[PDB]
Design an enzyme around this catalytic site. Structure first.
Site, short mmCIF file in Angstrom:
data_model
loop_
_atom_site.label_atom_id
_atom_site.label_comp_id
_atom_site.label_asym_id
_atom_site.label_seq_id
_atom_site.Cartn_x
_atom_site.Cartn_y
_atom_site.Cartn_z
N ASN A 8 0.83 -1.20 0.00
CA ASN A 8 0.00 0.00 0.00
C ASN A 8 0.86 1.24 0.00
OD1 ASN A 8 0.91 -0.47 2.81
ND2 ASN A 8 -0.44 1.31 3.24
N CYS A 12 2.07 4.17 1.50
CA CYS A 12 3.24 4.06 2.34
C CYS A 12 3.43 2.58 2.20
CB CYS A 12 2.93 4.48 3.76
SG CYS A 12 2.72 6.27 3.92
N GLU A 19 3.87 -0.07 3.45
CA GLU A 19 3.89 -0.69 4.79
C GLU A 19 3.09 -1.99 4.94
OE1 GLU A 19 1.45 2.26 4.57
OE2 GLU A 19 1.08 2.77 6.66
#
Ligand SMILES: Nc1ncnc2c1ncn2[C@@H]1O[C@H](COP(=O)(O)OP(=O)(O)NP(=O)(O)O)[C@@H](O)[C@H]1O
Ligand SMILES: Nc1ncnc2c1ncn2[C@@H]1O[C@H](COP(=O)(O)OP(=O)(O)NP(=O)(O)O)[C@@H](O)[C@H]1O
Ligand SMILES: [Mg+2]
Ligand SMILES: [Mg+2]
Lengths: 637, 637
Positions: free
Chosen positions: A351, A353, A355
């Site tokens: 996703n 960012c 992460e």
């Protein structure tokens, strides 16, 4: 705490008094303009507030509203405190108190402590949770990981539906699209060939603009994940390019490559790389590592793509990152190999960012249910230690909080709800790494900030893991846990190839986990947050130098204090600039904490005059380093 | 017929021989590039070609391929003749023969004549029919009239689906959107207000671009119909405006106003006009005339909108037409009042060429099933008459052809299929009005071209009407005919307020219609076609003047021959320019032929230096004149 704390207490004055009434106001509220009952509290929650009003108002401690950072409050006032009619109808504590209740229903005890810790800045949830928690559409979840449902028009426009139908409430979206055919590929309807991705993108980049006034943000930070063997790769990495006179002015899409190791191999052993429209090469985003190299390897054999110098792509890619700082790089194999949900299928994207890393399918949209613990508020004694019990402790709590969210969340699309429900992914985060370090006065490089690091995550993973067991002990394993690496006692570091740094008893744990299961397939997704140097300031007094005689060196320079006349070594080793710290130490601590992270997390190595050859060592370093989210971002100038 | 007929016969040489084999080729064809069976003939039809191959090849008469206009053939070759692999695999006759078969299955007799007439340039179907008729996806229908299914995101994106899912095959689309809320209207989800239409439009204007390589045309001629009381009206009429630096560069949308008489009243009696977001004023595009004026009138009473000088809109509107030549004007009440489908509900929009006018609902998308008869090829004797029997005759046929299309059509969206099936709208068209006139040597103004006119349509409507009865006599009334104006003996002119010009027996007709019903709710939609002065050339010989001594007056001027030295009156009255002819005679013949038109048809009055006051008399003239499609287009310079 500075000299503008007046904005708190003097505007603690235009605030009404007792939680209960403030709820009433908010509950009973009306559209002074359309005369529409416009509640900001769910029936469900409202009654809980009335049934207990006594113990609640009592419980709160409004003195805590002064314990807020200057720029911090502003954030809340501007965007988090529920306004009445243009006017702020919430003391920070109210917000907190409504969040706290948001999560637990009748579980007032749970509400109250999960209240107190918050108010005592120990941890906090994600904006989405902050904002809507308690209210009638309690969407408290952060991102959604969407699967390009089909390579038909019926599909695309069914996907495009969500990417709006979600985008309309909710938060960030990240969709992967390895299955859409490439430019000039073939329609078996008529004399058409394919438009490609880029126009199809121009489409998604467009619902993005329009669907927003509700999503309460013009920012449409969509990110698009794509494997680098897609025949449309080049045009894809180009999206944000400062040039394109009839193209994607995609001011809110970002392209992320979902990169198998094969590519990075070809690249290093300077070689070939073949491209495909997915239609000619089916099943490719569905295999990985070995199963994937057999597959891909053979479509080369079979001659189905358009062979290029592996070094060509890599070369263009690089160029793009510099000029735009994208595409992002996540390592497809690193991620699936070391995912606890490998049993479900193949994680096709992460996703924005870069992460979270959790399964998604055309009928499962994955969620980021997340809270984040404030690392600095466990520092404890002139000079000090870190309380790892407190950590383990608080992080046990948050893991409970977040679990609830999964059940009391308001789901934008039925997909979301299936996903979250069968798999129960959490994301504990952390704030204040860089701080904690400086507070325990340890320099970013210390081979003992090095040490501290590892231990922390070790403890968080350890706690979250355990907390999750007990609820799985109470409530049953998450619905799909069998076949789990954990359903066999294999854990995060175990999937990396390590032994725990052993500060917690992993045997007893690994023991029970097999015996009870866990409440969630994943637990932590550390550091890609902000709203979810000031440190020199203090120190410069005790030694000397100051203000009228010194409005100088830093106002100028970026807190880069190496070689400043009358200033201690102890300091200019501690208060090191980010360009100044070693990257292979950053990449390193990274791959360290990495071993106890269910999910992934992101790097932002920070070089100066980065070379198409320097960047490369950096990517290959981390690459080779076992990392999940490659180098995610490089900031230059 | 000019000196380049070589392009026909010399390229009648690279063509294979016997229909049957040409079909075989086309049927058996393969994707020389993907090795995919790429047929261009339906199983269904193929076998019909083999089972009869004998009588068929025989039947054809290839000498007819020379009987084609120079620029005409080119059209066919470039775009209509099925190519093989880049190379033309069809003699015009083959095309014809495949179209002919396309329509009737085993009805070879029907096929064969409906063959011959065509080949004898008597009539022809719509491109869509030409192009795909016979092939595996026999979509032969022209436009689709789409209903903005809801004022929810679920709705919009379900609509957006069609507007693609259709747009991907098919033809023009025209969707009406009176139900989407206005700019800054209110979301009962959150703190959002509405984006408006214009961004939502920017959306539809965007699937438009992308969904096309299959629709075999970048031209995305979408037209958008909207009543002028919508609060977003101004921004709407503006779409194509030569200025808008973050707006709709809607190079393929066109805005059409769907105008009730109230507006035109307010305007003339210089007054007020109120605007609404539809949400505050519900039901408005669902009432009309009186039921509508009660309704609207009262939302003014009730004070729900934003009262403006009726003359303000009208004024802006005008400005827009000149600068862009849009919005188009159709008269909402004129249309519903005089529709034969008034029983179903309220016709909310017409279509791009503002010609067809048929019901549409969020679960009915209406179709333009159309063919068009070649008015000139009934002229018959030095000087001549017009054969009205032949007309009646041929137009009986076409009405049969078109009916079939309705059953053998390949439907892009289930809506389309329901609609076409319960209502059976046809659209006979006509070509060669302006010609026929000049051939019978009658001037556009003659109060006897005036006469001829009326009679023609009178006969077509008369025939189509009758043909439709018999099949309704054979097959039963169309499914929804009860409640019909015709189900009560009320006919087109009867709904206007006239008596037929009586050249055909309408009593016997009106008689049977009540007794048998008709096969279709509508029949004709005349003159908004081209592919579905040369006349001087001839005449100038018999009198005098010519070529070497006269490459002059017209090469220069736009065939405007008023006052040319040595040139007859007889002529410069006949070969009148379009600016030169009277508009109130055009508007007039218009409103004349109008009485026998189930559907509508379109004006293109042609003034020079049009005034915000001249244009106005023109719109009000026609307006007052009972007309359905207002002035549709004004060409200037
Ligand atoms: N009219 C069109 N314009 C642009 N792209 C199209 C069009 N029609 C199909 N496609 C492409 O084809 C893919 C979706 O397939 P779809 O169009 O639904 O079926 P189809 O191509 O007609 N049949 P098939 O090739 O058998 O799937 C997408 O990647 C589209 O780009
Ligand atoms: N996030 C958004 N951005 C832009 N427009 C929106 C958004 N959400 C809703 N709308 C508008 O609201 C209309 C569709 O209603 P929809 O959003 O589906 O339900 P809703 O507005 O949340 N609830 P309600 O107001 O009760 O229908 C359209 O005209 C949209 O413009
Ligand atoms: Mg398909
Ligand atoms: Mg709604």
């Amino acid at each position: 705490t500075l000299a503008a704390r007046i904005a708190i207490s003097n505007l603690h004055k235009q605030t009404t008094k007792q939680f209960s009434k403030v709820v009433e106001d908010l509950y009973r509220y009306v559209n002074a303009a359309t005369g529409k009952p416009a509640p900001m509290i769910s029936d469900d929650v409202y009654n809980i507030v009335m049934e207990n009003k006594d113990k609640l108002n009592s419980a709160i401690v409004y003195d805590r509203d002064f314990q807020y950072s200057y720029f911090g409050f502003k954030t809340l006032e501007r965007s988090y405190l529920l306004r009445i009619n243009g006017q702020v109808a919430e003391r920070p504590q109210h917000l907190i108190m409504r969040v706290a209740l948001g999560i637990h229903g009748r579980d007032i005890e749970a509400a109250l402590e999960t209240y107190n810790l918050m108010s005592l800045k120990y941890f906090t949830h994600a904006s989405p949770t902050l904002f809507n928690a308690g209210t009638p559409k309690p969407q408290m979840s952060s991102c959604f990981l969407v699967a390009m449902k089909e390579d038909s028009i019926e599909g695309i426009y069914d996907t495009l539906k969500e990417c709006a139908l979600i985008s309309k409430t909710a938060g960030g979206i990240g969709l992967h699209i390895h299955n859409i055919r490439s430019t000039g590929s073939y329609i078996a309807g008529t004399n058409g060939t394919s438009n490609g991705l880029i126009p199809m993108i121009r489409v998604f980049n467009n619902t993005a603009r329009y669907v927003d006034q509700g999503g309460n943000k013009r920012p449409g930070a969509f990110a698009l994940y794509l494997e680098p063997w897609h025949a449309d790769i080049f045009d894809f990495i180009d999206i944000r390019k400062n040039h394109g006179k009839e193209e994607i002015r995609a001011r809110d899409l970002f392209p992320a490559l979902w990169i198998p190791d094969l590519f990075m191999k070809r690249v290093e052993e300077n070689g070939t790389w073949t491209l495909f429209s997915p239609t000619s090469a089916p099943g490719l985003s569905d295999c990985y590592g070995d199963e994937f190299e057999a597959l891909y390897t053979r479509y080369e054999k079979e001659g189905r793509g358009k062979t290029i110098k592996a070094q060509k792509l890599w070369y263009s890619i690089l160029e793009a990152q510099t000029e735009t700082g994208t595409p992002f790089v996540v390592y497809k194999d690193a991620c699936n190999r070391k995912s606890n949900q490998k049993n479900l299928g193949v994680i096709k994207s992460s996703n924005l960012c870069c992460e979270i890393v959790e399964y998604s399918a055309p009928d499962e949209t994955a969620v980021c249910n997340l809270a984040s613990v404030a690392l600095p508020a466990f520092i404890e004694t002139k000079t000090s230690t870190y309380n790892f019990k407190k950590l383990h402790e608080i992080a046990k709590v948050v893991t409970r909080n977040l679990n609830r969210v999964i059940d009391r969340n308001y789901y934008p699309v039925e997909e979301a709800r299936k996903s979250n429900m069968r798999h129960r992914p959490i994301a504990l985060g952390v704030q204040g790494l860089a701080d904690t370090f400086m507070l325990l006065r340890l320099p970013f490089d210390s081979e003992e900030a090095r040490l501290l690091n590892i231990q922390i995550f070790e403890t968080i993973y350890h706690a979250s893991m355990e907390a999750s067991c007990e609820l799985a002990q109470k409530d049953g394993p998450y619905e799909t846990f069998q076949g789990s690496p954990a359903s066999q006692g294999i854990l995060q570091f175990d999937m990396w190839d390590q032994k725990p740094y052993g500060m917690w008893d992993w045997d007893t744990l690994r023991k029970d986990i097999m015996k009870h299961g866990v409440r969630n397939s994943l637990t932590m997704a550390p550091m890609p947050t902000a709203s979810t140097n000031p440190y020199l300031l203090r120190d410069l007094v005790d030694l000397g130098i100051w203000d009228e005689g010194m409005k100088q060196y830093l106002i100028t320079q970026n807190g880069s204090i190496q070689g400043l006349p009358n200033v201690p070594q102890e300091l200019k080793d501690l208060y090191k600039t980010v360009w100044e710290i070693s990257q292979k130490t950053i990449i390193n601590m990274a791959a360290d904490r990495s071993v106890y992270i269910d999910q992934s997390h992101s790097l932002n190595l920070f070089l100066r005059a980065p070379t198409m050859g320097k960047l490369t060592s950096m990517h290959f370093y981390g690459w080779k380093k076992g990392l999940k989210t490659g180098m995610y971002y490089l900031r230059t100038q």
